[PDB]
């Protein structure tokens, strides 16, 4: 039909508009910035206890407890200071690909190949952790989930949909559609008004939690996007895809800003996180080790190498103190 | 040098570490099979043959050996994004209908699927049980249409046994890893009550091979 020509004209309009505002590049402005040097990080703790591969993790807002989900059907809440397991929750589905720790600390969530996001109640009476709410509604596997409050959680699935739920009622108050491939990640904003979602169609869409519409749409990668993370300002975000390239976009300029790439890396990125001041960009890779980039100048300022299998999950604390990298050899390591 | 209730936190951690170790040594004596095959092949048949939406798990037990079967047919998404969750299954049960050498061929989609999962990055050593379904109807429709309409290089007869052996030998040479893995081919039908015994006799060899891999002899 003739609507495809209208779509092509509007895409060329958007391309000309976002090319008109590219007054400079990030490198030629950040040349007046002293590099951070050789960042050397040592494995402080080494949390061991999982028996199969670790697919997800999330820190706590007190930056001491963390949760980790693995393929042996276990969530484990660790005290990362003393390496004591605080809790160990058995799941009724062994195929978990995501987990999330609530910002209050009362709740934890997990989801995976059974298309259901289970919400567990940590701070309960009668002792043990029990399942508060199973949120079913997606038709593909769950790739990420993130708490907003103790009653709102946004999920992103592999049926090309994100969703905003309500854990008391138990059903989707919003459904975010617009992706053509499987959504693989998610990152809430600091003020939690917006969130980005990267998908398998190499597009990252900036959504809007209050009005369920795709606010902006970014492209630039060549392959499926596996990880996404917000800048601490809340105005930018970095992605990591299967073409060995991380990419720093921008929300106010609707364009990519910097490409974190190196010719010696030929494997995709599994997880991405930022430092607290936004100076470093941490990125977990498939060639068994994590990389540390200077996020303003784009060079490998450090390498975290201590894992024997694929680094799958990665998270920097809320006070910026440590970095937990969990991998497919069932070990998490707290670097500092 | 620890407090009176840091000692008890450490003791709680040791007790739930003991529970993790016990439940992981219990759930490693389970045989985790992965069911695969094309649509309308024989997967939903062989679930019912062996005395019995996301992952569809099916637990059963045959002579002091617990089995888990993971049907993945209802996972309509990208296979390249969750198949490494099954890296480490004991065996892949791949179903192929023999009566698809003329449907719209449709045996060639199954051969491309076998070549896709048999030479995968994650299943470089996972053995494959290979079920060939409805032989008693494949021989009924072999008297009319020839096998040459799906195999143009077939320099053979239209006997049921010769055609079935040609189909099996056309499947078993798709693995490039002839030494690392192996294929256990079977001809089943609706009246058997012995396919589960083939599954048991075929995964006992994978169990022995993995025990021998743990001892150093690959």
């Amino acid at each position, epitope marked *: 039909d003739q609507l495809r020509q209208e779509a092509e004209q509007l895409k060329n309009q958007i391309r000309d508009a976002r090319k008109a505002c590219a007054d400079a590049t990030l490198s030629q402005i950040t040349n007046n910035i002293d590099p951070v040097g050789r960042i050397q990080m040592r494995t402080r703790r080494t949390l061991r206890g999982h028996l199969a591969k670790i697919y997800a993790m999330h820190w706590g807002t007190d930056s*001491r*407890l963390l949760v980790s989900a693995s393929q042996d059907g276990k969530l484990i809440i660790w*005290d990362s200071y*003393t390496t*004591n397991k*605080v*809790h160990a929750i058995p799941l009724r589905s062994s195929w978990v690909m995501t987990c999330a720790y609530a910002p209050s600390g009362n709740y934890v969530a997990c989801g995976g190949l059974d298309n259901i996001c289970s919400i567990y109640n940590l701070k309960t*009476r*009668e*002792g*043990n952790v029990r399942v508060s709410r199973e949120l079913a509604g997606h038709t593909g596997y769950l790739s990420c989930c993130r708490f907003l409050d103790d009653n709102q959680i946004v999920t992103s699935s592999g049926d090309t949909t994100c969703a905003l739920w309500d854990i008391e009622t138990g059903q989707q108050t919003t459904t975010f559609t617009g992706h053509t491939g499987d959504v693989m990640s998610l990152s809430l904003a600091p003020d939690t008004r917006l969130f980005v979602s990267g998908a398998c169609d190499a597009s990252a869409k900036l959504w809007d939690v209050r009005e369920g519409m795709c606010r902006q749409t970014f492209t630039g990668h060549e392959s499926d996007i596996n990880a996404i993370c917000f800048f601490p300002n809340g105005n930018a975000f970095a992605t990591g895809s299967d073409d060995a390239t991380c990419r720093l976009f921008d929300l106010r300029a609707d364009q990519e800003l910097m490409t974190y790439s190196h010719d010696n890396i030929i494997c995709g990125i599994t997880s991405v996180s930022f430092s607290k001041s936004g100076r470093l960009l941490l990125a977990g890779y498939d060639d068994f080790n994590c990389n540390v980039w200077d996020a303003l100048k784009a060079d490998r300022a450090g390498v975290l190498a201590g894992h024997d299998n694929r680094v799958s999950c990665l998270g920097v604390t809320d006070d910026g103190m440590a970095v937990a990298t969990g991998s497919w050899d069932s070990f998490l390591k707290i670097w500092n | *040098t620890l*407090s*009176a*209730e*840091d*000692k*008890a*936190a450490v*003791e*709680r951690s040791k*007790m739930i570490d003991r529970n993790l170790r016990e439940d992981g040594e219990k759930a490693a004596r389970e045989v985790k099979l992965l069911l695969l095959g094309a649509g309308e092949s024989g997967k939903s048949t062989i679930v019912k043959q062996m005395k019995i939406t996301g992952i569809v798990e099916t637990h059963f037990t045959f002579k002091d050996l617990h089995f888990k079967m993971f049907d993945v047919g209802g996972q309509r998404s990208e296979r390249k994004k969750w198949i490494h969750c099954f890296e480490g299954v004991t065996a892949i049960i791949f179903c192929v209908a023999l009566s698809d050498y003329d449907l719209v061929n449709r045996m060639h989609e199954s051969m491309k699927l076998f070549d896709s999962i048999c030479n995968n990055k994650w299943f470089t050593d996972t053995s494959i049980i290979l079920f060939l379904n409805k032989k008693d109807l494949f021989e009924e429709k072999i008297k009319k249409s020839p096998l040459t309409i799906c195999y143009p290089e077939y320099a053979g007869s239209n006997t049921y046994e010769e055609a079935a052996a040609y189909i099996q030998c056309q499947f078993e040479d798709l693995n490039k890893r002839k030494d690392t893995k192996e294929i256990y081919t079977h001809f089943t039908c609706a009246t058997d009550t012995k396919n589960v015994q083939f599954v048991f006799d075929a995964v006992t060899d994978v169990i022995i091979k993995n025990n021998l891999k743990d001892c150093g002899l690959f």
Partner: single-chain antibody
Amino acid sequence: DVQLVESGGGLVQPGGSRKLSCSASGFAFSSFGMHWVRQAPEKGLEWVAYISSGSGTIYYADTVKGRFTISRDDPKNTLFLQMTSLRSEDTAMYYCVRSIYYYGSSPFDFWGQGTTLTVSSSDIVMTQATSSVPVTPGESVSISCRSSKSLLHSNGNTYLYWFLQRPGQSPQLLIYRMSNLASGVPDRFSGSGSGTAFTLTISRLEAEDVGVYYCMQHLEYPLTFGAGTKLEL
């Protein structure tokens, strides 16, 4: 609902043996450490025994060791204390307390009914000055407490626990580890203080605040209770 119902007790000849039990119904009993805590019919509270989760670590008080045995039955959810050769210092009310220990837990949160046992006729000292002060409802009050050793450990905690005992009731956790307020307790209570110097302020003292208030330490065993402050009208 959580219930800890004790049984056994009554009149016992001196020198005889008895055994109290504590049926636990309503919570995951196998994960909780259990305590037996004594209370004399005119004095205050004193700690008797503590068995751990999974019976790994057992502690007794120094004035009760050797002739008492604390044990538990986890499939049956019961907690036994078998006492042998009862003296005249062992006529008291025995309470069954639960306490779970991990990062952020609230120990000593639930207390049992407590059973009466009537016979026939380098520890840390925790002072409290016994300041049984009268107070009108509506105003503020502040109860003090003092130790002989610094309760502030190296990790950052300050193991001081505050308990309220109403007239004719079991005790109840208000403040655990100096600062943190327990659950189900209104936010008017506040714990504060530095090493060996603690205080508990109540703002707008309402009804059901009259009663005895105890300060316990959990820095190292044996656990020593304060003498008690009996607020009244």
